[PDB]
């Protein structure tokens, strides 16, 4: 998709959602 996994790095924004455990 969009940059490593899904929408850059695993899910939204370096890692999951916006820094890992989001």
């Not at 969009?2 to 850059?8: C, M, P, T």
């Amino acid at each position: 998709p969009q940059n490593a996994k899904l929408k850059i790095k695993r899910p939204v924004k370096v890692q999951p959602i916006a820094r890992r455990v989001y």
